[PDB]
């Protein structure tokens, strides 16, 4: 998912 959570 390119829109998966990218954050820590």
């Amino acid at each position: 998912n390119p829109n998966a959570n990218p954050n820590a």
Partner: antibody
Amino acid sequence: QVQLVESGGGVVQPGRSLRLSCAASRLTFRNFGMHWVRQTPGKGLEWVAVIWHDGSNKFYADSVEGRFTISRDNSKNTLYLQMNSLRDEDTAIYYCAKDWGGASDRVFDYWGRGTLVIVSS
Amino acid sequence: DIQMTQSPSTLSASVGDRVTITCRASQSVSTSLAWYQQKPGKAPNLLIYQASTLYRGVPSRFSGSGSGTEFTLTIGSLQPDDFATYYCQHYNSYSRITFGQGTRLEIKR
């Protein structure tokens, strides 16, 4: 007050390369995903790429995959976009955009002022 | 890519009016949809996400509705600061982000 400042724009011939950088201030940079978003002469907005907080994952727009590389140096709170094989369709204002941090929504709470890239012979 | 289309391209209104603008997706984006405001020479500012949730600090006169392929942004009683361009943006799972082309809210005279 979070601040994002882009640099590296200019005029370049098609096929050449250019490196953009974005310096983040007053932000725990390493906690957040970061994006590049560009705005075309027609005022259209186009998402360009995203990079994970720790650089362990990246995704790209179909338009730029294979030509652009997103990276970050969390030691210097700096985001980069390496642009190679530039096309005239890449002419735009480039903004670094912070991921707002909510797991389920890819939306941008803070934006830089943008850096202009003109691709022309 | 999913195509986002906004209607109308330009909308004329007066201070105090209620206005609604529409955003349509070429396939369902569930409620993975946000709206932004942009004025000349400035970067966009986030207004609404997940179709209907107001972002921090956004005035209560803004609201959003819709799901699937059809979404609306409503401004209940326009203020001078609201004349601007508005964009929608999806972030549907497994689909790369795209934006609508913008709707400009101009002053009627």
